[PDB]
Design a protein around this motif. Structure first.
Motif, PDB file in Angstrom:
ATOM      1  N   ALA A 177       0.829  -1.197   0.000  1.00  8.68           N
ATOM      2  CA  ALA A 177       0.000   0.000   0.000  1.00  8.68           C
ATOM      3  C   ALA A 177       0.869   1.255   0.000  1.00  8.68           C
ATOM      4  O   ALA A 177       1.836   1.340   0.764  1.00  8.68           O
ATOM      5  N   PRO A 178       0.548   2.234  -0.852  1.00 16.09           N
ATOM      6  CA  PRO A 178       1.280   3.510  -0.818  1.00 16.09           C
ATOM      7  C   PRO A 178       1.173   4.233   0.511  1.00 16.09           C
ATOM      8  O   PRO A 178       2.127   4.920   0.900  1.00 16.09           O
ATOM      9  N   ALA A 179       0.051   4.097   1.213  1.00 17.76           N
ATOM     10  CA  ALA A 179      -0.137   4.724   2.514  1.00 17.76           C
ATOM     11  C   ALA A 179      -1.291   4.056   3.250  1.00 17.76           C
ATOM     12  O   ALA A 179      -2.392   3.933   2.706  1.00 17.76           O
ATOM     13  N   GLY A 180      -1.050   3.625   4.483  1.00 17.49           N
ATOM     14  CA  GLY A 180      -2.071   2.978   5.275  1.00 17.49           C
ATOM     15  C   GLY A 180      -3.015   3.979   5.912  1.00 17.49           C
ATOM     16  O   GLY A 180      -2.924   5.192   5.715  1.00 17.49           O
ATOM     17  N   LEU A 181      -3.944   3.444   6.696  1.00 21.63           N
ATOM     18  CA  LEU A 181      -4.914   4.246   7.423  1.00 21.63           C
ATOM     19  C   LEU A 181      -4.584   4.216   8.909  1.00 21.63           C
ATOM     20  O   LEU A 181      -4.423   3.142   9.498  1.00 21.63           O
ATOM     21  N   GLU A 182      -4.484   5.398   9.507  1.00 20.97           N
ATOM     22  CA  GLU A 182      -4.076   5.547  10.897  1.00 20.97           C
ATOM     23  C   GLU A 182      -5.316   5.581  11.781  1.00 20.97           C
ATOM     24  O   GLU A 182      -6.197   6.425  11.592  1.00 20.97           O
ATOM     25  N   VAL A 183      -5.381   4.665  12.741  1.00 19.70           N
ATOM     26  CA  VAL A 183      -6.512   4.560  13.654  1.00 19.70           C
ATOM     27  C   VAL A 183      -6.119   5.203  14.976  1.00 19.70           C
ATOM     28  O   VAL A 183      -5.215   4.720  15.668  1.00 19.70           O
ATOM     29  N   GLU A 184      -6.794   6.292  15.325  1.00 18.52           N
ATOM     30  CA  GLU A 184      -6.481   6.992  16.560  1.00 18.52           C
ATOM     31  C   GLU A 184      -7.054   6.236  17.757  1.00 18.52           C
ATOM     32  O   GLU A 184      -8.068   5.543  17.627  1.00 18.52           O
ATOM     33  N   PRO A 185      -6.429   6.342  18.928  1.00 21.82           N
ATOM     34  CA  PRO A 185      -6.929   5.622  20.104  1.00 21.82           C
ATOM     35  C   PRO A 185      -8.258   6.183  20.584  1.00 21.82           C
ATOM     36  O   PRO A 185      -8.629   7.327  20.314  1.00 21.82           O
ATOM     37  N   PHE A 186      -8.987   5.343  21.316  1.00 25.86           N
ATOM     38  CA  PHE A 186     -10.272   5.718  21.886  1.00 25.86           C
ATOM     39  C   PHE A 186     -10.369   5.112  23.275  1.00 25.86           C
ATOM     40  O   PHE A 186      -9.753   4.071  23.533  1.00 25.86           O
ATOM     41  N   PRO A 187     -11.126   5.723  24.186  1.00 27.11           N
ATOM     42  CA  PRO A 187     -11.330   5.103  25.502  1.00 27.11           C
ATOM     43  C   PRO A 187     -12.201   3.862  25.372  1.00 27.11           C
ATOM     44  O   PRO A 187     -13.352   3.938  24.940  1.00 27.11           O
ATOM     45  N   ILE A 188     -11.638   2.715  25.743  1.00 28.99           N
ATOM     46  CA  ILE A 188     -12.291   1.422  25.576  1.00 28.99           C
ATOM     47  C   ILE A 188     -13.423   1.295  26.584  1.00 28.99           C
ATOM     48  O   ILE A 188     -13.384   1.898  27.664  1.00 28.99           O
ATOM     49  N   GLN A 189     -14.443   0.514  26.226  1.00 31.48           N
ATOM     50  CA  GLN A 189     -15.589   0.282  27.093  1.00 31.48           C
ATOM     51  C   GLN A 189     -15.888  -1.196  27.307  1.00 31.48           C
ATOM     52  O   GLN A 189     -16.772  -1.522  28.105  1.00 31.48           O
ATOM     53  N   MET A 190     -15.185  -2.088  26.614  1.00 26.38           N
ATOM     54  CA  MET A 190     -15.542  -3.498  26.629  1.00 26.38           C
ATOM     55  C   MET A 190     -15.154  -4.157  27.947  1.00 26.38           C
ATOM     56  O   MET A 190     -14.220  -3.732  28.634  1.00 26.38           O
ATOM     57  N   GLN A 191     -15.876  -5.220  28.284  1.00 24.02           N
ATOM     58  CA  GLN A 191     -15.475  -6.152  29.328  1.00 24.02           C
ATOM     59  C   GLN A 191     -14.919  -7.392  28.636  1.00 24.02           C
ATOM     60  O   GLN A 191     -15.654  -8.117  27.956  1.00 24.02           O
ATOM     61  N   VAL A 192     -13.619  -7.618  28.783  1.00 18.95           N
ATOM     62  CA  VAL A 192     -12.991  -8.797  28.204  1.00 18.95           C
ATOM     63  C   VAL A 192     -13.095  -9.945  29.196  1.00 18.95           C
ATOM     64  O   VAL A 192     -12.531  -9.886  30.296  1.00 18.95           O
ATOM     65  N   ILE A 193     -13.815 -10.992  28.808  1.00 24.04           N
ATOM     66  CA  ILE A 193     -14.007 -12.174  29.644  1.00 24.04           C
ATOM     67  C   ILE A 193     -13.203 -13.284  28.973  1.00 24.04           C
ATOM     68  O   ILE A 193     -13.718 -14.026  28.130  1.00 24.04           O
ATOM     69  N   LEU A 194     -11.931 -13.403  29.340  1.00 20.65           N
ATOM     70  CA  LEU A 194     -11.090 -14.453  28.786  1.00 20.65           C
ATOM     71  C   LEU A 194     -11.477 -15.801  29.376  1.00 20.65           C
ATOM     72  O   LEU A 194     -12.074 -15.881  30.449  1.00 20.65           O
ATOM     73  N   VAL A 195     -11.135 -16.871  28.663  1.00 17.63           N
ATOM     74  CA  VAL A 195     -11.386 -18.232  29.121  1.00 17.63           C
ATOM     75  C   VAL A 195     -10.120 -19.048  28.906  1.00 17.63           C
ATOM     76  O   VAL A 195      -9.466 -18.929  27.865  1.00 17.63           O
TER      77      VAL A 195
END
Lengths: 49, 49, 49
Positions: free
Chosen positions: C1-19
Protein backbone atom coordinates in the motif's frame (compact mmCIF):
# COMPACT_ATOMS: atom_id res chain seq x y z
CA UNK A 1 13.73 9.87 32.10
CA UNK A 2 11.31 8.66 34.77
CA UNK A 3 11.80 5.27 36.41
CA UNK A 4 9.45 3.47 38.76
CA UNK A 5 7.47 0.29 39.39
CA UNK A 6 4.51 -0.33 37.07
CA UNK A 7 0.93 0.57 37.99
CA UNK A 8 2.27 3.82 39.46
CA UNK A 9 0.45 6.25 37.16
CA UNK A 10 3.73 7.78 35.99
CA UNK A 11 2.34 8.73 32.57
CA UNK A 12 -0.85 10.27 33.95
CA UNK A 13 0.80 12.36 36.67
CA UNK A 14 3.62 13.37 34.32
CA UNK A 15 1.12 14.56 31.71
CA UNK A 16 -0.91 16.39 34.35
CA UNK A 17 2.17 18.26 35.58
CA UNK A 18 3.42 18.96 32.05
CA UNK A 19 0.07 20.44 31.01
CA UNK A 20 0.50 23.11 33.70
CA UNK A 21 3.70 24.45 32.12
CA UNK A 22 3.79 27.24 29.54
CA UNK A 23 6.06 27.72 26.52
CA UNK A 24 5.94 30.84 24.36
CA UNK A 25 4.49 30.14 20.90
CA UNK A 26 6.15 26.91 19.72
CA UNK A 27 7.14 27.71 16.12
CA UNK A 28 5.24 25.95 13.36
CA UNK A 29 7.27 23.16 11.79
CA UNK A 30 7.27 22.57 8.04
CA UNK A 31 9.19 20.87 5.24
CA UNK A 32 10.90 22.84 2.46
CA UNK A 33 12.21 20.99 -0.63
CA UNK A 34 15.63 22.46 -1.42
CA UNK A 35 15.78 20.16 -4.46
CA UNK A 36 13.89 17.29 -6.07
CA UNK A 37 15.21 14.82 -3.47
CA UNK A 38 16.36 17.04 -0.57
CA UNK A 39 13.92 18.06 2.17
CA UNK A 40 14.90 20.52 4.91
CA UNK A 41 13.15 21.01 8.24
CA UNK A 42 12.09 24.62 8.80
CA UNK A 43 10.67 26.49 11.78
CA UNK A 44 8.49 29.57 11.39
CA UNK A 45 6.60 31.97 13.67
CA UNK A 46 2.99 30.94 14.27
CA UNK A 47 0.70 32.12 11.50
CA UNK A 48 3.49 32.52 8.95
CA UNK A 49 2.72 29.08 7.49
CA UNK B 1 0.66 -32.37 56.75
CA UNK B 2 0.66 -32.45 60.55
CA UNK B 3 0.17 -29.31 62.63
CA UNK B 4 0.07 -31.25 65.92
CA UNK B 5 2.47 -33.34 67.95
CA UNK B 6 6.23 -33.74 67.66
CA UNK B 7 8.54 -35.40 65.16
CA UNK B 8 12.28 -35.80 64.70
CA UNK B 9 13.90 -33.87 61.85
CA UNK B 10 10.55 -33.22 60.16
CA UNK B 11 9.39 -29.64 59.63
CA UNK B 12 6.38 -28.12 57.85
CA UNK B 13 8.34 -25.45 56.01
CA UNK B 14 6.64 -22.44 54.44
CA UNK B 15 7.09 -21.43 50.80
CA UNK B 16 5.33 -19.25 48.23
CA UNK B 17 4.34 -21.20 45.13
CA UNK B 18 5.07 -19.80 41.67
CA UNK B 19 4.37 -23.12 39.94
CA UNK B 20 0.82 -22.26 41.13
CA UNK B 21 -1.11 -19.05 41.88
CA UNK B 22 0.92 -16.84 44.20
CA UNK B 23 0.27 -17.98 47.77
CA UNK B 24 2.20 -19.17 50.81
CA UNK B 25 1.73 -22.74 51.97
CA UNK B 26 3.59 -25.45 53.93
CA UNK B 27 5.34 -28.59 52.71
CA UNK B 28 6.88 -31.45 54.67
CA UNK B 29 10.69 -31.26 54.83
CA UNK B 30 12.66 -34.34 55.90
CA UNK B 31 16.30 -34.44 57.01
CA UNK B 32 18.29 -37.69 57.07
CA UNK B 33 21.40 -37.55 59.26
CA UNK B 34 23.28 -40.65 58.13
CA UNK B 35 26.86 -41.52 59.16
CA UNK B 36 28.99 -41.61 56.03
CA UNK B 37 30.32 -39.06 53.54
CA UNK B 38 31.35 -35.62 54.81
CA UNK B 39 29.38 -34.14 51.89
CA UNK B 40 25.86 -32.76 52.35
CA UNK B 41 23.41 -33.56 49.54
CA UNK B 42 20.32 -31.51 48.69
CA UNK B 43 18.37 -33.35 45.98
CA UNK B 44 15.81 -30.54 45.58
CA UNK B 45 18.50 -28.46 43.84
CA UNK B 46 21.15 -30.99 42.84
CA UNK B 47 20.26 -33.19 39.87
CA UNK B 48 23.73 -33.90 38.49
CA UNK B 49 25.72 -32.12 35.79
CA UNK C 1 0.00 0.00 0.00
CA UNK C 2 1.28 3.51 -0.82
CA UNK C 3 -0.14 4.72 2.51
CA UNK C 4 -2.07 2.98 5.27
CA UNK C 5 -4.91 4.25 7.42
CA UNK C 6 -4.08 5.55 10.90
CA UNK C 7 -6.51 4.56 13.65
CA UNK C 8 -6.48 6.99 16.56
CA UNK C 9 -6.93 5.62 20.10
CA UNK C 10 -10.27 5.72 21.89
CA UNK C 11 -11.33 5.10 25.50
CA UNK C 12 -12.29 1.42 25.58
CA UNK C 13 -15.59 0.28 27.09
CA UNK C 14 -15.54 -3.50 26.63
CA UNK C 15 -15.47 -6.15 29.33
CA UNK C 16 -12.99 -8.80 28.20
CA UNK C 17 -14.01 -12.17 29.64
CA UNK C 18 -11.09 -14.45 28.79
CA UNK C 19 -11.39 -18.23 29.12
CA UNK C 20 -8.66 -20.78 29.69
CA UNK C 21 -7.13 -23.45 31.84
CA UNK C 22 -5.31 -22.31 35.01
CA UNK C 23 -2.04 -23.28 33.32
CA UNK C 24 -2.98 -21.14 30.30
CA UNK C 25 -3.06 -17.95 32.40
CA UNK C 26 0.05 -19.02 34.34
CA UNK C 27 2.10 -18.02 31.30
CA UNK C 28 0.51 -14.55 31.35
CA UNK C 29 0.34 -13.81 35.10
CA UNK C 30 4.15 -13.63 35.36
CA UNK C 31 4.36 -10.14 33.84
CA UNK C 32 3.15 -7.24 36.04
CA UNK C 33 1.27 -5.75 33.06
CA UNK C 34 -1.37 -8.49 33.23
CA UNK C 35 -2.15 -7.57 36.84
CA UNK C 36 -2.55 -3.83 36.19
CA UNK C 37 -5.20 -4.63 33.57
CA UNK C 38 -6.97 -7.63 35.12
CA UNK C 39 -8.15 -7.91 38.72
CA UNK C 40 -10.96 -10.46 38.23
CA UNK C 41 -10.26 -14.20 38.34
CA UNK C 42 -13.36 -16.35 37.84
CA UNK C 43 -12.01 -19.50 39.45
CA UNK C 44 -13.35 -22.98 38.71
CA UNK C 45 -12.40 -26.03 40.76
CA UNK C 46 -12.67 -29.63 39.53
CA UNK C 47 -14.54 -30.34 42.77
CA UNK C 48 -17.74 -29.05 44.34
CA UNK C 49 -19.02 -29.43 47.92
Amino acid sequence: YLVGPPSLGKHEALLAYLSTQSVETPPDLLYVPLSERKVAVLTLPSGQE
Amino acid sequence: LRTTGRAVGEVNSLVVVEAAPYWGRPARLTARAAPGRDHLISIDREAGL
Amino acid sequence: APAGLEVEPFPIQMQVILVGTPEAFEGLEEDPAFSELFRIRAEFSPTLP
